[PDB]
């Protein structure tokens, strides 16, 4: 659900994480490169076991694997990580490696046909 | 270049000799324990040799059989310890036909140094000639001046025809050329432009006349320079190559004798 | 489409920017395929209705 | 792109040196610059 | 670098069993993975110091599979008969 | 290969990068969630 | 190695001394031998 | 990170001057008051040292003498560690690429202080580096496969993609494989199961030096003729330990240490008894260390001192001895004595085997327990265990161990480093390769494969040389099949290189290139005579002294004349071969390249053309 | 069975040197697996100096020529600086000699090398003949049609 994706303190998520003064926490960061637009801000993602989720159905075409859409996505999201900056001599997590608001990291899981025991 | 490369590159060209039913080579005995092997590029030479054998030995002349092998395994056995098979004076040599060696020596002395002796086996090549594949332009090597120049005449005809129709292409381009030059040489008021544009016409047609001079002088130029060499030397050079001569030798290969004719 | 190399030199060597733009706008081409091939697609129509009686 | 990128580092530099005025002295012309270079790309990663 | 070994198992070798180093979250575990057709996995596996193991892959394929398939087809009848025999004779003999 | 090659060959996407265009319909709401912390 | 030739009936010399008389003349200065 | 360097300070004092401090007196240790004398105090006269020694500032040198004499136990340890890390900090340094001085103590602490960098190094995670270019911090395409990194998880060895192992300086090509059998296998009994092998041994030897020494004497002949005479046999016997030859023998089965230990004692006893005095070279150069430069080695200077190191090396060996043969060694087989005392000391060192391998009855204190080279039971040695042996020139022995298996966690061990033991060195070399070796097959194979690189090449051919006799490289071109129909014989090409044999045109082009040759070499000779007149007619203000320096000036003035002649000849070479064309340069390259000796810098007239080919550079 | 290979090697080597000398004389007259491994128990420079300490080289040969010819920020990760530090420390300890047992900090690289190396240098085009427009209940269709149309009309303004 869009409000259960990021850790924004929207008053539609169940109050899982709260302060002493009972105000939910939020993790926004105003994107110094592109301000003035809240949807391009950075924020942490919520643990998967705390999301409310739709479970949609989809038929894949008969040429899904040999078209390379999932491979393109996997490669795009897994080819970015930490870096060392020698100009400023330090480790750095770049901005293009962080999740904007409402974005999550994909987990692909395949089932085993032999695990059925009909 | 390793020996496997030359064993693969020399295979198409064969050579004839004679063996026994025991698959043994025949040799010629001499003085103080000497023998020698032979390899005749035309089997009639070995046939005449054993016809001479029949002159003095009928047994050996019935005991003959005519073998034809490429230079592959004879070059292999050259690249071996000859005393492993038994050697105390067995010197394998080649025996080219006198026709092509005579053509070779007339090539030799139509250059300026007249002699009547030859080294090796005569190989022929032509300047500009190179057989192009779907990927690269390899150099064909001809033991036969007839086959060499039969390929060379086809290549010469096709190239000089390409040149004649090239000059017809420039004839098209230049009929268009004089069109613009003529379209204002006397069509408008004269002065600056008449001088400039008929100097342009002089430019264009003196250049195109020297051009056609070049085009047909190419045919009036002689036969592209034919060269002759020794097979002994070209092989021992092919074997001991590394570096620039590597890429040089790596695209030369030898055609079969009397293959281009029929 | 096959372009003449002059168009390539025009888009390449010209240090200008809109010079390259006008070069790429004024470039021409030729298509040898118009001299060797003419392709047509057809469907072999049917002679039986998908719900008729002879079906 | 030149003006946009320069103004981006400018804005983040204003923000930082206004957040902590103590190192806003010229003594840090290589220090606050070292922080701007680290902050224009992402977040500084602690080893742990 | 938190896995030590992977072993490609199965009659078609698409599942791998993965051994997790002590440097992993949760200590040592044995974890099974079904993999997609990803032509980039083998390089990622070797160039990080992983011990890869493969089966014997039994080249024949329609001679390796015949008797086991006969068993897959005949054994359910034996299971059903044994279950019913147990209940209906091993009690009320 | 392709078409329009001559025209084929004629900002901060290298840092933050792309802007996601599937979720503008929530922008407004987020703004409100910033203007009233007590919510 | 190499062999010298002289187109005269052409004579030949090996580094015994074959003579290609236009037939042949296997001079010595008897082809009763075989491989072993 | 690194790069904590220092300045150009005088620490290495060129020992000829330090003996002035060796015969010094009235010195001291300390530092006086700064309020009176300036910082940098090594000066102490009579008056001021007297006053401060009555004051409490500085003690005298023989003061420190009897203080160290009296210092016992804990503060002895204190000042020990003090002066130790002090001298490690300000006296012994290494060098960076910039040539500065990083010391011993700071480097020690930098290495074994940060455990976080050790944790980084232990794992594999490779992290791209942001571009120092400021705009986007885009990581560069550096990446890297690093075939040493691609090889972990493997068991036997590390595949290396050739050139990578060459740039790693692994200059020990494998020479021979043999096997120590408890009982060699029989063809007749069933399947040869009777074969029980003790160890699986391999040998290696330095290939550059194998080309350097043995390639200059036994190179250039018939290989069979070179190996056929026993002079080469005594050569490979006595010059073995000079090459730093290595023997790597691995465990093939279960081995209890007592068993194989008694086996080794009985094995090296007979080689200890039956051998004569050793044949050793003469040490031409002292090779002192330069503590302040603790990673600098002089052999590049030794080969490139004046660019004419032949003459200086000759006048240097003039002191020690003149070599006994072609390669450059002045042999000296030691006399009657020094031939049994060393053998007695070797027998003693072997007498320590049952004691050092098996000290006492408790394995808990045995040196083998507690690590995977042997079992946890303390009495068996594991299969895959490897022993490396190396022999320095001057009787020194190096010995290491390595438990095999997963390359990612292989454990290497250094056992001991004894020196001067020429007897055991000779015993090992003449036992592995001697007249009666443990297996003459590997001896023969190793001698022949030590012959093969003396021609210049290297077994395990790490140069992709297409004329390598054992492992040749092929060319990517495909053998073209000339077609029968005349349709691909284009002739539309303008040029292709001339590759005929001896013909009517190539003799001519070679003779005109020879005309250019004589013009060029005559220009070179007259330029050398010009440089002669230049060096002669100039008034060099030189006091006649230091005859070695004057001989060096002679040699390198001749060298300068030769170099000016070389430049002149190269100029007229470009002139002529520009005038005639590229066919001349191609055939000249061919003849010069073949004319160069396969096993030398410049060797087996041809000298002129190959020197001028060096002017082609 | 290494000697078979090395017999072929001796064949090739003798033929190579013989043909090289032959063509040298020729053109001068015209003018006028057993062994695939590598190790390094000691740095090459160190033992090279230690050995050359006894040898007078009259001239430098090909292999040493290559070595001295190869003698003369993309690697600025702290791991690489630690690497070079351990490198120099282990070299120093290697040539410092000249539990009672030491194990190294690095491993010795026993290396294999590859042999038989080379020179250093959509959519688909299906189409029907004639579309079958669905010609050959409907009141509800027309009803919903015009109803949605007039709903849109009233919702325009
Ligand atoms: C015939 C032996 C052959 C391999 C050669 C090995 C066993 C020899 C070569 C160098 C020797 C050591 C030199 C100094 C040490 C240290 C001292 O504490 C005690 C003696 C000891 C071990 C020496 C004795 C054992 C060492 C290793 C095998 C393959 C048959
Ligand atoms: C690989 C053969 C092996 C026998 C062990 C051999 C290699 C011997 C020769 C060198 C010795 C070391 C030299 C002297 C030191 C110092 C001394 O105080 C304590 C013992 C210790 C470590 C010695 C420990 C044992 C060493 C390695 C087995 C497999 C037959």
PDB file of N, CA, C and O in Angstrom, chain H residues 314-362:
ATOM      1  N   UNK H 314      84.931  -6.007 -15.308  1.00  0.00           N
ATOM      2  CA  UNK H 314      86.214  -6.673 -15.511  1.00  0.00           C
ATOM      3  C   UNK H 314      87.278  -6.120 -14.572  1.00  0.00           C
ATOM      4  O   UNK H 314      87.997  -6.875 -13.906  1.00  0.00           O
ATOM      5  N   UNK H 315      87.394  -4.791 -14.499  1.00  0.00           N
ATOM      6  CA  UNK H 315      88.350  -4.206 -13.566  1.00  0.00           C
ATOM      7  C   UNK H 315      87.939  -4.424 -12.113  1.00  0.00           C
ATOM      8  O   UNK H 315      88.769  -4.249 -11.214  1.00  0.00           O
ATOM      9  N   UNK H 316      86.683  -4.805 -11.866  1.00  0.00           N
ATOM     10  CA  UNK H 316      86.260  -5.135 -10.509  1.00  0.00           C
ATOM     11  C   UNK H 316      86.655  -6.561 -10.139  1.00  0.00           C
ATOM     12  O   UNK H 316      87.166  -6.806  -9.041  1.00  0.00           O
ATOM     13  N   UNK H 317      86.415  -7.517 -11.038  1.00  0.00           N
ATOM     14  CA  UNK H 317      86.875  -8.880 -10.798  1.00  0.00           C
ATOM     15  C   UNK H 317      88.389  -8.999 -10.851  1.00  0.00           C
ATOM     16  O   UNK H 317      88.926 -10.017 -10.399  1.00  0.00           O
ATOM     17  N   UNK H 318      89.081  -7.999 -11.406  1.00  0.00           N
ATOM     18  CA  UNK H 318      90.538  -7.977 -11.339  1.00  0.00           C
ATOM     19  C   UNK H 318      91.050  -8.172  -9.921  1.00  0.00           C
ATOM     20  O   UNK H 318      92.078  -8.831  -9.729  1.00  0.00           O
ATOM     21  N   UNK H 319      90.355  -7.622  -8.926  1.00  0.00           N
ATOM     22  CA  UNK H 319      90.760  -7.799  -7.537  1.00  0.00           C
ATOM     23  C   UNK H 319      90.539  -9.235  -7.077  1.00  0.00           C
ATOM     24  O   UNK H 319      91.483  -9.922  -6.673  1.00  0.00           O
ATOM     25  N   UNK H 320      89.294  -9.708  -7.138  1.00  0.00           N
ATOM     26  CA  UNK H 320      88.973 -11.041  -6.668  1.00  0.00           C
ATOM     27  C   UNK H 320      89.624 -12.147  -7.473  1.00  0.00           C
ATOM     28  O   UNK H 320      90.534 -12.818  -6.979  1.00  0.00           O
ATOM     29  N   UNK H 321      89.185 -12.328  -8.718  1.00  0.00           N
ATOM     30  CA  UNK H 321      89.728 -13.360  -9.594  1.00  0.00           C
ATOM     31  C   UNK H 321      89.124 -13.194 -10.979  1.00  0.00           C
ATOM     32  O   UNK H 321      88.072 -12.574 -11.149  1.00  0.00           O
ATOM     33  N   UNK H 322      89.806 -13.766 -11.965  1.00  0.00           N
ATOM     34  CA  UNK H 322      89.340 -13.781 -13.350  1.00  0.00           C
ATOM     35  C   UNK H 322      88.547 -15.068 -13.551  1.00  0.00           C
ATOM     36  O   UNK H 322      88.972 -16.128 -13.071  1.00  0.00           O
ATOM     37  N   UNK H 323      87.393 -15.032 -14.222  1.00  0.00           N
ATOM     38  CA  UNK H 323      86.576 -16.247 -14.346  1.00  0.00           C
ATOM     39  C   UNK H 323      87.326 -17.385 -15.022  1.00  0.00           C
ATOM     40  O   UNK H 323      88.243 -17.175 -15.818  1.00  0.00           O
ATOM     41  N   UNK H 324      86.913 -18.609 -14.691  1.00  0.00           N
ATOM     42  CA  UNK H 324      87.539 -19.822 -15.198  1.00  0.00           C
ATOM     43  C   UNK H 324      86.973 -20.275 -16.539  1.00  0.00           C
ATOM     44  O   UNK H 324      87.528 -21.193 -17.149  1.00  0.00           O
ATOM     45  N   UNK H 325      85.895 -19.662 -17.014  1.00  0.00           N
ATOM     46  CA  UNK H 325      85.244 -20.137 -18.228  1.00  0.00           C
ATOM     47  C   UNK H 325      84.421 -18.999 -18.825  1.00  0.00           C
ATOM     48  O   UNK H 325      84.599 -17.827 -18.474  1.00  0.00           O
ATOM     49  N   UNK H 326      83.521 -19.350 -19.741  1.00  0.00           N
ATOM     50  CA  UNK H 326      82.812 -18.382 -20.567  1.00  0.00           C
ATOM     51  C   UNK H 326      81.747 -17.595 -19.814  1.00  0.00           C
ATOM     52  O   UNK H 326      81.605 -16.392 -20.058  1.00  0.00           O
ATOM     53  N   UNK H 327      80.997 -18.230 -18.913  1.00  0.00           N
ATOM     54  CA  UNK H 327      79.832 -17.565 -18.341  1.00  0.00           C
ATOM     55  C   UNK H 327      80.231 -16.449 -17.383  1.00  0.00           C
ATOM     56  O   UNK H 327      79.510 -15.454 -17.247  1.00  0.00           O
ATOM     57  N   UNK H 328      81.370 -16.586 -16.714  1.00  0.00           N
ATOM     58  CA  UNK H 328      81.873 -15.543 -15.837  1.00  0.00           C
ATOM     59  C   UNK H 328      82.094 -15.959 -14.402  1.00  0.00           C
ATOM     60  O   UNK H 328      82.043 -15.096 -13.509  1.00  0.00           O
ATOM     61  N   UNK H 329      82.336 -17.223 -14.123  1.00  0.00           N
ATOM     62  CA  UNK H 329      82.552 -17.685 -12.759  1.00  0.00           C
ATOM     63  C   UNK H 329      84.005 -18.095 -12.579  1.00  0.00           C
ATOM     64  O   UNK H 329      84.571 -18.824 -13.404  1.00  0.00           O
ATOM     65  N   UNK H 330      84.616 -17.616 -11.498  1.00  0.00           N
ATOM     66  CA  UNK H 330      85.970 -18.000 -11.109  1.00  0.00           C
ATOM     67  C   UNK H 330      85.845 -19.088 -10.045  1.00  0.00           C
ATOM     68  O   UNK H 330      85.717 -18.809  -8.853  1.00  0.00           O
ATOM     69  N   UNK H 331      85.885 -20.341 -10.490  1.00  0.00           N
ATOM     70  CA  UNK H 331      85.658 -21.461  -9.594  1.00  0.00           C
ATOM     71  C   UNK H 331      86.783 -21.583  -8.569  1.00  0.00           C
ATOM     72  O   UNK H 331      87.930 -21.195  -8.805  1.00  0.00           O
ATOM     73  N   UNK H 332      86.427 -22.123  -7.407  1.00  0.00           N
ATOM     74  CA  UNK H 332      87.406 -22.414  -6.366  1.00  0.00           C
ATOM     75  C   UNK H 332      86.913 -23.614  -5.580  1.00  0.00           C
ATOM     76  O   UNK H 332      86.121 -23.459  -4.644  1.00  0.00           O
ATOM     77  N   UNK H 333      87.374 -24.798  -5.959  1.00  0.00           N
ATOM     78  CA  UNK H 333      87.062 -26.008  -5.213  1.00  0.00           C
ATOM     79  C   UNK H 333      87.932 -26.039  -3.967  1.00  0.00           C
ATOM     80  O   UNK H 333      89.165 -26.085  -4.057  1.00  0.00           O
ATOM     81  N   UNK H 334      87.295 -26.000  -2.800  1.00  0.00           N
ATOM     82  CA  UNK H 334      88.041 -25.888  -1.555  1.00  0.00           C
ATOM     83  C   UNK H 334      88.973 -27.080  -1.374  1.00  0.00           C
ATOM     84  O   UNK H 334      88.744 -28.165  -1.916  1.00  0.00           O
ATOM     85  N   UNK H 335      90.039 -26.861  -0.609  1.00  0.00           N
ATOM     86  CA  UNK H 335      91.125 -27.822  -0.462  1.00  0.00           C
ATOM     87  C   UNK H 335      90.730 -28.913   0.533  1.00  0.00           C
ATOM     88  O   UNK H 335      89.556 -29.085   0.874  1.00  0.00           O
ATOM     89  N   UNK H 336      91.723 -29.674   0.991  1.00  0.00           N
ATOM     90  CA  UNK H 336      91.518 -30.782   1.908  1.00  0.00           C
ATOM     91  C   UNK H 336      90.667 -30.464   3.119  1.00  0.00           C
ATOM     92  O   UNK H 336      89.645 -31.120   3.342  1.00  0.00           O
ATOM     93  N   UNK H 337      91.068 -29.472   3.910  1.00  0.00           N
ATOM     94  CA  UNK H 337      90.262 -29.038   5.040  1.00  0.00           C
ATOM     95  C   UNK H 337      89.101 -28.200   4.504  1.00  0.00           C
ATOM     96  O   UNK H 337      89.032 -27.896   3.310  1.00  0.00           O
ATOM     97  N   UNK H 338      88.165 -27.830   5.380  1.00  0.00           N
ATOM     98  CA  UNK H 338      86.878 -27.226   5.048  1.00  0.00           C
ATOM     99  C   UNK H 338      85.996 -28.177   4.249  1.00  0.00           C
ATOM    100  O   UNK H 338      84.890 -27.792   3.852  1.00  0.00           O
ATOM    101  N   UNK H 339      86.447 -29.409   4.006  1.00  0.00           N
ATOM    102  CA  UNK H 339      85.691 -30.408   3.270  1.00  0.00           C
ATOM    103  C   UNK H 339      85.173 -31.525   4.159  1.00  0.00           C
ATOM    104  O   UNK H 339      84.323 -32.304   3.719  1.00  0.00           O
ATOM    105  N   UNK H 340      85.680 -31.644   5.377  1.00  0.00           N
ATOM    106  CA  UNK H 340      85.157 -32.586   6.356  1.00  0.00           C
ATOM    107  C   UNK H 340      84.518 -31.894   7.546  1.00  0.00           C
ATOM    108  O   UNK H 340      83.515 -32.383   8.072  1.00  0.00           O
ATOM    109  N   UNK H 341      85.079 -30.763   7.982  1.00  0.00           N
ATOM    110  CA  UNK H 341      84.458 -29.979   9.043  1.00  0.00           C
ATOM    111  C   UNK H 341      83.047 -29.553   8.659  1.00  0.00           C
ATOM    112  O   UNK H 341      82.120 -29.638   9.473  1.00  0.00           O
ATOM    113  N   UNK H 342      82.861 -29.100   7.418  1.00  0.00           N
ATOM    114  CA  UNK H 342      81.519 -28.763   6.957  1.00  0.00           C
ATOM    115  C   UNK H 342      80.649 -30.010   6.858  1.00  0.00           C
ATOM    116  O   UNK H 342      79.462 -29.980   7.196  1.00  0.00           O
ATOM    117  N   UNK H 343      81.229 -31.127   6.412  1.00  0.00           N
ATOM    118  CA  UNK H 343      80.481 -32.379   6.346  1.00  0.00           C
ATOM    119  C   UNK H 343      80.157 -32.885   7.746  1.00  0.00           C
ATOM    120  O   UNK H 343      79.081 -33.448   7.981  1.00  0.00           O
ATOM    121  N   UNK H 344      81.067 -32.684   8.703  1.00  0.00           N
ATOM    122  CA  UNK H 344      80.773 -33.065  10.082  1.00  0.00           C
ATOM    123  C   UNK H 344      79.658 -32.204  10.663  1.00  0.00           C
ATOM    124  O   UNK H 344      78.775 -32.708  11.369  1.00  0.00           O
ATOM    125  N   UNK H 345      79.673 -30.903  10.364  1.00  0.00           N
ATOM    126  CA  UNK H 345      78.600 -30.025  10.823  1.00  0.00           C
ATOM    127  C   UNK H 345      77.276 -30.378  10.159  1.00  0.00           C
ATOM    128  O   UNK H 345      76.212 -30.258  10.773  1.00  0.00           O
ATOM    129  N   UNK H 346      77.325 -30.823   8.905  1.00  0.00           N
ATOM    130  CA  UNK H 346      76.117 -31.271   8.218  1.00  0.00           C
ATOM    131  C   UNK H 346      75.561 -32.541   8.845  1.00  0.00           C
ATOM    132  O   UNK H 346      74.346 -32.665   9.050  1.00  0.00           O
ATOM    133  N   UNK H 347      76.436 -33.507   9.134  1.00  0.00           N
ATOM    134  CA  UNK H 347      76.012 -34.704   9.847  1.00  0.00           C
ATOM    135  C   UNK H 347      75.413 -34.342  11.197  1.00  0.00           C
ATOM    136  O   UNK H 347      74.422 -34.941  11.622  1.00  0.00           O
ATOM    137  N   UNK H 348      75.991 -33.349  11.878  1.00  0.00           N
ATOM    138  CA  UNK H 348      75.417 -32.875  13.133  1.00  0.00           C
ATOM    139  C   UNK H 348      74.019 -32.303  12.922  1.00  0.00           C
ATOM    140  O   UNK H 348      73.087 -32.632  13.666  1.00  0.00           O
ATOM    141  N   UNK H 349      73.859 -31.433  11.921  1.00  0.00           N
ATOM    142  CA  UNK H 349      72.558 -30.822  11.662  1.00  0.00           C
ATOM    143  C   UNK H 349      71.507 -31.878  11.347  1.00  0.00           C
ATOM    144  O   UNK H 349      70.334 -31.723  11.701  1.00  0.00           O
ATOM    145  N   UNK H 350      71.910 -32.961  10.677  1.00  0.00           N
ATOM    146  CA  UNK H 350      70.977 -34.058  10.443  1.00  0.00           C
ATOM    147  C   UNK H 350      70.759 -34.885  11.706  1.00  0.00           C
ATOM    148  O   UNK H 350      69.680 -35.464  11.877  1.00  0.00           O
ATOM    149  N   UNK H 351      71.745 -34.930  12.603  1.00  0.00           N
ATOM    150  CA  UNK H 351      71.584 -35.610  13.880  1.00  0.00           C
ATOM    151  C   UNK H 351      70.518 -34.963  14.750  1.00  0.00           C
ATOM    152  O   UNK H 351      70.087 -35.570  15.736  1.00  0.00           O
ATOM    153  N   UNK H 352      70.091 -33.745  14.415  1.00  0.00           N
ATOM    154  CA  UNK H 352      69.076 -33.032  15.176  1.00  0.00           C
ATOM    155  C   UNK H 352      67.671 -33.318  14.663  1.00  0.00           C
ATOM    156  O   UNK H 352      66.703 -32.723  15.144  1.00  0.00           O
ATOM    157  N   UNK H 353      67.538 -34.235  13.708  1.00  0.00           N
ATOM    158  CA  UNK H 353      66.239 -34.504  13.105  1.00  0.00           C
ATOM    159  C   UNK H 353      65.322 -35.274  14.053  1.00  0.00           C
ATOM    160  O   UNK H 353      64.189 -34.831  14.283  1.00  0.00           O
ATOM    161  N   UNK H 354      65.740 -36.413  14.628  1.00  0.00           N
ATOM    162  CA  UNK H 354      64.840 -37.091  15.574  1.00  0.00           C
ATOM    163  C   UNK H 354      64.573 -36.274  16.822  1.00  0.00           C
ATOM    164  O   UNK H 354      63.567 -36.507  17.503  1.00  0.00           O
ATOM    165  N   UNK H 355      65.449 -35.321  17.144  1.00  0.00           N
ATOM    166  CA  UNK H 355      65.215 -34.447  18.286  1.00  0.00           C
ATOM    167  C   UNK H 355      64.319 -33.268  17.929  1.00  0.00           C
ATOM    168  O   UNK H 355      63.385 -32.961  18.676  1.00  0.00           O
ATOM    169  N   UNK H 356      64.578 -32.601  16.800  1.00  0.00           N
ATOM    170  CA  UNK H 356      63.754 -31.453  16.433  1.00  0.00           C
ATOM    171  C   UNK H 356      62.375 -31.892  15.959  1.00  0.00           C
ATOM    172  O   UNK H 356      61.368 -31.260  16.297  1.00  0.00           O
ATOM    173  N   UNK H 357      62.299 -32.989  15.200  1.00  0.00           N
ATOM    174  CA  UNK H 357      60.984 -33.496  14.717  1.00  0.00           C
ATOM    175  C   UNK H 357      60.217 -34.140  15.882  1.00  0.00           C
ATOM    176  O   UNK H 357      58.988 -33.924  15.971  1.00  0.00           O
ATOM    177  N   UNK H 358      60.911 -34.896  16.733  1.00  0.00           N
ATOM    178  CA  UNK H 358      60.301 -35.575  17.875  1.00  0.00           C
ATOM    179  C   UNK H 358      61.021 -35.169  19.156  1.00  0.00           C
ATOM    180  O   UNK H 358      61.865 -35.910  19.674  1.00  0.00           O
ATOM    181  N   UNK H 359      60.723 -33.979  19.686  1.00  0.00           N
ATOM    182  CA  UNK H 359      61.231 -33.629  21.018  1.00  0.00           C
ATOM    183  C   UNK H 359      60.306 -34.142  22.112  1.00  0.00           C
ATOM    184  O   UNK H 359      59.166 -33.689  22.250  1.00  0.00           O
ATOM    185  N   UNK H 360      60.805 -35.101  22.882  1.00  0.00           N
ATOM    186  CA  UNK H 360      60.077 -35.607  24.021  1.00  0.00           C
ATOM    187  C   UNK H 360      58.933 -36.524  23.644  1.00  0.00           C
ATOM    188  O   UNK H 360      58.653 -36.765  22.465  1.00  0.00           O
ATOM    189  N   UNK H 361      58.242 -37.056  24.657  1.00  0.00           N
ATOM    190  CA  UNK H 361      57.134 -37.985  24.411  1.00  0.00           C
ATOM    191  C   UNK H 361      55.759 -37.345  24.302  1.00  0.00           C
ATOM    192  O   UNK H 361      54.790 -38.062  24.020  1.00  0.00           O
ATOM    193  N   UNK H 362      55.639 -36.036  24.514  1.00  0.00           N
ATOM    194  CA  UNK H 362      54.337 -35.379  24.512  1.00  0.00           C
ATOM    195  C   UNK H 362      54.122 -34.634  23.203  1.00  0.00           C
ATOM    196  O   UNK H 362      54.846 -33.662  22.926  1.00  0.00           O
TER     197      UNK H 362
END
